[PDB]
Design a protein around this ligand. Structure first.
Ligand code: HEM
Length: 153
């Protein structure tokens, strides 16, 4: 469980992210696709993008970035009490999109990378540690739903 102090460090930096959701969303997905090319193959709607310049130019990619970070934000603001928000997400990602838990670990790493680039002063080691905890909590609760459905993996 995160403490109240750690949740405050998470939400203090998230309020920054929310100043520019679309720029953040795009940086994170591009970092994910460049660092782990196998993730791009899951998106029929983005598979055609071959370079970083092409990714940067895609309005649809940017629009999906907003989708992802808006869902993540709604979870983070529930500070662990996120059952209603998380359940539909795990169901679709396990059963419809077929996303391995490992990929959620990849995109967690991408989020931390980008937060670190854009918000140094609000993202020192203590914030980084709290954000890693929040994302681990996210993954741990999703993995439990996967297991139930028969997708641990
Ligand atoms: C921070 C973690 C993630 C969040 C909050 C997230 C959230 C979402 C949301 C809200 C949607 C649209 C509604 C739905 O289908 O559930 C979605 C769709 C999708 N996500 Fe994620 N996602 C996450 C991670 C990933 C990762 C790691 C992959 C692939 C490596 C993935 C692949 C997909 C796919 C394939 C779709 C459908 C895209 C389309 O064709 O419209 N997601 N995600």
């Amino acid at each position: 469980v995160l403490s109240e102090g750690e949740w405050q460090l998470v939400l203090h930096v998230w309020a920054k992210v929310e100043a520019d959701v679309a720029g953040h969303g795009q940086d994170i997905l591009i970092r994910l696709f460049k660092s782990h090319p196998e993730t791009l193959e899951k998106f029929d709607r983005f598979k055609h993008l071959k370079t970083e310049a092409e990714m940067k130019a895609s309005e649809d990619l940017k629009k999906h970035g907003v989708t992802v970070l808006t869902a993540l934000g709604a979870i983070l603001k529930k500070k662990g009490h996120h059952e209603a928000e998380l359940k539909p997400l795990a169901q679709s990602h396990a059963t419809k999109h077929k996303i391995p838990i490992k990929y959620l670990e990849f995109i967690s790493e991408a989020i931390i990378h980008v937060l670190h680039s854009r918000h140094p002063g609000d993202f020192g080691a203590d914030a980084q540690g709290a954000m890693n905890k929040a994302l681990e909590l996210f993954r741990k609760d999703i993995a439990a739903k996967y297991k139930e459905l028969g997708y641990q993996g």
